[PDB]
Amino acid sequence: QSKILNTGKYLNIFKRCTGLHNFESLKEKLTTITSLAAPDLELKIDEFYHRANKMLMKLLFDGYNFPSVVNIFQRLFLFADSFQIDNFIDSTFSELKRGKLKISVSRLQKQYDDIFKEKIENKVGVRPSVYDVLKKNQKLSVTSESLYKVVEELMDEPTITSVDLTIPLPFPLNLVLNQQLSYQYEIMFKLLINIKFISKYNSSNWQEMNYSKIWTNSHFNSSVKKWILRCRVLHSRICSFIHELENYIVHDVIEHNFEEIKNLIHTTATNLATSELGSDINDEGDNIFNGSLIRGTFNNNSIFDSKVHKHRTTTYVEGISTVEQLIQKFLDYSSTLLNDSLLTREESLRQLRKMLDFIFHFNNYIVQVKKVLVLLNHELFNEYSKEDQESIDKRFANLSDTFLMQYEKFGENLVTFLATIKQVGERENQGLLELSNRLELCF
Amino acid sequence: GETITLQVGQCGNQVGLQYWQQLATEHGIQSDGSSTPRNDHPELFFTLSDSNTYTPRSILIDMEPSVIAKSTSALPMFNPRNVHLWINGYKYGTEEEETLLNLIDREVDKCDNLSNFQLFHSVAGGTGSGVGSKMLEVISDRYGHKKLLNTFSIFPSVQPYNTILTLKRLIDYSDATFVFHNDSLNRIENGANKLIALVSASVSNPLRFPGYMYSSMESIVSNLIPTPDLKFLTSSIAPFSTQKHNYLNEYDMLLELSNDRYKTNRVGDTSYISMLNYLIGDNLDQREIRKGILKSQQRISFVPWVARSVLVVHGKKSPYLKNTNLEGIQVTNNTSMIDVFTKILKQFDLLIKRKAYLNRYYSSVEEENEVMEMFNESRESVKSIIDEYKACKEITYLDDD
Amino acid sequence: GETITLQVGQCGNQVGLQYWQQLATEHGIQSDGSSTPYPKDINDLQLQELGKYRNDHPELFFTLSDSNTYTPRSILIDMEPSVIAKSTSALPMFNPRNVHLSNNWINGYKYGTEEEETLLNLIDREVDKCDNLSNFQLFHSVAGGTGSGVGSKMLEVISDRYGHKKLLNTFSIFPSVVVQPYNTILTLKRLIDYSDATFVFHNDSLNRIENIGANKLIALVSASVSNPLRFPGYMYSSMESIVSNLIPTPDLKFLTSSIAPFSTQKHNYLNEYDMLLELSNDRYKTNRVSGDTSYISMLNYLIGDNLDQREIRKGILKSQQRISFVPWVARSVLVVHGKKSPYLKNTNLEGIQVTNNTSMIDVFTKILKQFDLLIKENEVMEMFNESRESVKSIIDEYKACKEI
Amino acid sequence: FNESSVNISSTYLRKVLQDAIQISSVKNFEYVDRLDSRVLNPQHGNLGWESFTIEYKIDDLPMSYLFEGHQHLQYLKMFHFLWKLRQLNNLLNWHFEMFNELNHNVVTKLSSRNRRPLAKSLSIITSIRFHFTQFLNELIAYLSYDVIEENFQQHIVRKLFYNKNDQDLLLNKSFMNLSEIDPNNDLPKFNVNLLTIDELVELHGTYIDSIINSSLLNEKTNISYIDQIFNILQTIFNFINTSQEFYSLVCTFGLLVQDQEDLEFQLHKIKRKIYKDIYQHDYKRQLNDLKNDLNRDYNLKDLSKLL
Amino acid sequence: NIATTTKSREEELNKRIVNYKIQLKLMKNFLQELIDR
Amino acid sequence: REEELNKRIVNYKIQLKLMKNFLQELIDRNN
Predict the structure, then answer these.
(1) E15 touches chain A (CB under 8 A)
(2) Touching D: which chains, 3+ CB pairs < 8 A?
(3) Does chain D have fewer CB atoms within 10 Å around its N or its C terminus?
């Protein structure tokens, strides 16, 4: 039943896409099913299904350039080329960190289109590139469903938590890049944008902490100097932790899994390049008649079909040969990306959410600290005031307890996070185990 | 963001010529600035005209026209408008402050979003070292601290006075200073500018050939400078490449990149403050890199208060270089800086107690007092950085006791 | 596991060059490091009308680079560059990085001590390329000058730098001049202290076998000892397992080897049964052995295609009675069914026998007597006394081995 | 494998298998993909060594339907026995390495006063280990090159490729004219005996049965050979476990240089236990009984002389 | 007891559930878009 | 323990089938 339905659908897709009314141009020799009681009905169905797959595969790969669509999706969604998104974050850093409702939504669209979907036109008759076609399709919009809420279903906050990217696709490409696959890609986009943004917040804060006039001032007393030194070291620890986490997520999960699909798709492209379009099917005179009718209720051979199993398919020999495997490979890849990342379990997701929240709030606290340090030292307070000992002692005492609280909170979060990764990696995921080893060897 | 290169002195100009030749070769830009048949981003280092010509962003500064003439003739695509022609040199730099300030402001206006200033200069360059020392001051003053500076200073192999005077401003104003020694460079070779050019070109590889990560200089530098005091970096290069008997795997690159003989500065026992390894090949096997990272973390001695993380960037090789085998660069932050700084201070004290050549600098009583106070300040700053690097080694660094 | 080979001295380099050429020939690795496609298996029968795949383990010795080029795990240590130049020219595959270039034993020992850091860095570099290291192999001459002192210092350095956690073999070659006996005893002292299993080769007995060069026989024996490791089979396949089967106590560690010469002459051995009996002959042992000898352990190597099991069983049964076993060791004879390399066209069998007998009493007695005759700062004389006492410590032990 | 069978998870098994594939020579094997490890019965009282089994996946081929589960179960039983034997063979190698290293690290550097007794005890221990290694090697050699290899060459190679000469093949029908040939020259002659489906099943079943039900491995002093062999294996296990205690005591003796006398007394006690009970009282007695048992059989007399 | 195997059983089941949670929610969104018109 | 995951899997299979049947009912009625 599945073979019949899918053969017919695939031929219908081909006709509707390339515009042919019928397959006369191919001039292939075809054999029709002579009777329902014929013995080769299964063979004929298999041959027709293989013909339909052959045509639709060559359409998608050779004609619709699917291999390049895979690289385009990789770039746009998983940042295989991070230069453009880095410029985007740099250009709108002040906006993205503001609460959802406290900023104009319509501005982000434009500030994204100037970066990504810029264009230079080409003369009539010059073929557009597939990247050219898909650039203008994409749309980035703010959504009400935050990452930590949308991911909880498939088990204000700053705008970064709620910025999404969607890419409608041409027919028939959207049939292989099914909406379920694009949704799993979108989740990864949101996660990676969160981590990229925090890394951009960790670099800017590192620039001020080291070279801004207030922080770099030499005229502080010894106590404030040691406080600054402790804060710088703690921020360095946070920076290293975030870079390690991002490295794992992006190289140890995305690129490593993508290598397999890239190799397979290249092999399939090379296989189809040398393959003609349309296959000839021949048959004999089939004189069996009564020796094949087997009329009645049925034969007792139905038991063998159920007895056998077809769960053994591997080695991806000669690349992908059926569109169903083509879709299945990408679905498995997306499921692997979600499962490896710390978003599938409840313990891992909760620990990740606490860690990211703590880092973001620590950066905000660092920003608010800059104001306080003005009052402590005198040499720069006079300059900034142009536009008491007890009070200064109180200010420093308050900063002591606040900074100690942040320091101990970091220690607690780190311990819990490492324990959670260790248990999950030992139980289910191999990739998380080596990350646990690396992080344990760090601290 | 875009970067601006500053070349000062004869050694700086020669190193810059090699550096720009390497960069143009990597991006396929011809000597005349014409393109050769994009995913890479040379715009961060070259200005693109609407007539399809690439010209370097660098600024050439030298006391004599012979070196600049050789550099410009070798690479015709240099813009002549950017060409300009110890204490005496620094006072000369004061006179030309307006012209140089406007000259640099032209490049800053020409770019869209400035990121950092690169500086190629020699500490032991005499007069040119003075003009570069003034360049750092004027740039840091006018542009504040929002834009950071990177100095690829070449250390020395009367010189002690010049080295101390240049190192005072190098400590004060630079944000991330590489250290190169001609001694270790010629030891590795057993010309020398081709190693410095290669290291500097590879340091920015993740910017010009983007990948998943490390898309900005802030990310590259912030991983290596926990404190603004400890700003000196030690760079290591693996020389065994392009031979038949080259490293069998990237894992052996990670293990053998840490050898002390390949480091570009004289080293005994050292403690590493931060690490970052460059691997640049068309295809890189992940599992080898994971094994190498684990071994490197278990083998290297980090200081107690550092997170103890080793970062490996997966650089991409240029399409214009044909199928060459893997190569890699290592940039580290060690406590070995105390040895070289102590050597410089010992030479300076030995030659300051003996009034050997101070007559060339002390012109009168007021000049004597000026030079004495300047020298004292420089010596105190160098001692301060030595004491800071020494206090980093011990375990009570974070304690208030 | 992996094995690292170290060659010290002119004689050691001469032996090692042919040893590595032998291994390269067996594994089909050309002199330039290029690999040869593996021929189809012979006993893997297939139906008939009427590239990287392998089933051996060459990488146990050669480092397989990312470009499909092999390179030996060898380290060449000496002072005269002529032998190294000849070795490298013969085998360009040798890594130039692995070569180190610089009569009295004391002078060589002190030179090794002064320059120990560089050699140690080289050893660590070679180890870093090895995962799960197993053992070290040393090719050096007990007497001869550079080899004695440099090999002794390297022995001590390797023994104490890794905590003795890996066994360390020794393919020592004994000499057949006033300084030679001193060198022999001084090196044998460290062989007793550090080495885990020593293959004693005597040049005079090697000349006795040859006339029926001398380094080719040593290379053949050394390259045939590790046949089970490079072509894994049911038993052994590990260097520790082979050695552990012949060394009952740490003191009785000195092994000797017997070689069947007639691997190529057209009057070769008829079958496995004949060769099993011929291997026990005392005229083809590499160490002079008398009729009063007694064997502590037995191990026979057979290398051929589809050996007949009946012949091997009958040969073992007949040879068990002939051999005079030590009273406290159970009568046990073991035969290794090695696999011939498919690259070799020669179909004739080869067989090497490795034994741990009590003939070492006479050999060390000759060495001791010559040393005593020659003896007739002060620190060196104390070391001479210590070497004399250490050698006697196993002379009397091998004598006591006779007793229950 | 040290921890209980319930603690071992799938990811650790996969890591172990992949590391072992990379280390060994199977990484170049043609069908390295088909290899897969598993744990059969994760009971609390079973350690890793008593449950690990290597499984060769042939499910992707129709051949798997010919090979019924009973044959595979008999392939996993014989593997279990051989796995125990090789586990002990390798444990003795680790014992040899650790004691040899300890000899150089502690005993030879100890004070000359008590060096001699410790040297004697260590030599005794190592000689006992050597005896056990010889016995295990002889047993493995006999099984491998007289049971598995002979049965393979006799029941598989000689059934498939060599002629199954029979009384009907004896008759040369060409005394009849028989000029004609059928069905056609297009039908190949295939260098292998044409076997029916039931014939293939029976062939592989007999090949497995011959090995599992060999003379030594059958269930037939009113005790079977397998029980005696397993008793000797238990003796070797006890020897290893006690030698570890001796290792710890001697290293504690090395660290010391009134406690010296106590440690020396404990060393003498351990040496007495291992030398007398385990070896003299148990191993030699069991081996004597086994050797006498084997001589009653014509087939195993030759093995008895060696083993 | 059920046999242990190198492949993570619980991981496979969990991935199936997550893939069944994506299909359900996408179908719900589509039905909401369909009903409100 | 994994029985519980299988039970939830089958429950979601039924829920998905119900949703698809709802789509078919709605489309049939609108036509």
Answers:
(1) yes
(2) A, C, E
(3) N
Question: Which position has the token pair 């295609």?
Answer: C305
> Phi/psi of residue B387, each to 5°?
-65, -40
Give helix B337-353 / helix B365-393 axis angle, nearest 10°: 150
- Determine contact: F12 vs chain E, CB below 8 A: yes
Question: F30 at the E interface (CB within 8 A)?
Answer: no
Burial pattern B293-325, b for ≥16 Cβ within 10 A else e, equals bbbbbeeeebbebbbbbbbbbbbbbbeeeeeee
Alpha-carbon dihedral of residues C6, C11, C17, C18, nearest 10 degrees? -120
- Answer yes or no: do D14 and A430 touch at CB < 8 A: yes
Backbone angles phi, psi at D43, to 5 degrees: -90, 155
Flag whether residue D15 sits within 8 Å of chain A, measured between CB atoms.
yes
- Other Cβ atoms less than 10 A from the Cβ of A219: the count is 10
Four-point Cα dihedral A258, A261, A265, A267, nearest 10: 110
The H-assigned helical ranges of B85-126 are 87-95, 97-110
Technique that determined the structure = cryo-EM
Residue type (1 letter), D184: N
Q: Do chains D and F touch (3 or more CB pairs under 8 A)?
A: no
Question: Could E21 and F12 be called an inter-chain contact, meaning their C-beta atoms sit closer than 8 Å?
Answer: yes
* Integer Cα distance of C164 and C159 in angstroms: 5
Resolution, angstroms, 1 dp:
3.6
Candidate from A312, A315, A426 with C-beta closest to D59: A312
Cross-chain Cβ contact E11/A184 below 8 Å: no
Q: Determine the Cα–Cα distance for residues A138 and D11; give it in Å rounded to an integer.
A: 40
Q: Is the dihedral of CA C6, C10, C12, C13 positive or negative?
A: positive
What type of residue sits at position B133? S
Give the number of other Cβ atoms within 10 Å of residue D238's Cβ. Answer: 16
Q: Pick from D8, D17, D38: which is nearest to E3 by CB?
A: D38
Alpha-carbon gap, residue C220 to C209, rounded angstroms = 13
Considering CB atoms only, which of E16, E34, E35 is closest to F9? E16
Nearest to F8 among E10, E17, E24 (CB): E17
Distance CA B59, CA B81 (A): 9
Give the minimum alpha-carbon distance from A213 to chain E in angstroms, rounded to a whole number: 51
Instruction: Report strand pairing: C197-202 vs C167-170.
Output: parallel
Q: Contact, B40 vs B208, CB < 8 A? A: yes
Min Cα–Cα distance to chain E from D257, Å: 49
**Which 3-state string (H, E, C) describes chain A?**
CHHHHHHHHHHHHHHHHHCCCCCCCCCCCCCCCCCCCCCCHHHHHHHHHHHHHHHHHHHHHHHCCHHHHHHHHHHHHHCCCCHHHHHHHHHCHHHHCCEHHHCCHHHHHHHHHCCCCCCCCCCCCCCCCHHHHHHCCCEEEECCCCHHHHHHHCCCCEHHHHEEEECCCCCCHHHHCCHHHHHHHHHHHHHHHHHHHHHHHHHHHHHHHHHCHHHHCCCCCHHHHHHHHHHHHHHHHHHHHHHHHHHHHHHHHHHHHHHHHHHHHHHHHHHHHCCCCCCCCCCCCCCCCHHHHCCCCCCCCHHHHHHCCCCCCCCCCCCCCCHHHHHHHHHHHHHHHHHHCCCCCHHHHHHHHHHHHHHHHHHHHHHHHHHHHHHHCCCCHHHHHCCCHHHHHHHHHHHHHHHHHHHHHHHHHHHHHHHHHHHHHHHCCHHHHHHHHHHHHHC
With beta carbons less than 8 A apart as the criterion, state whether D281 and D291 touch: no
Radius of gyration of chain C, Cα coordinates, nearest whole angstrom: 21
What amino acid is encoded at B22 in this protein? Answer: Q
Note whether B286 contacts A256, CB cutoff 8 Å. yes
CB contacts of D59 in chain A (<8 Å) are 312
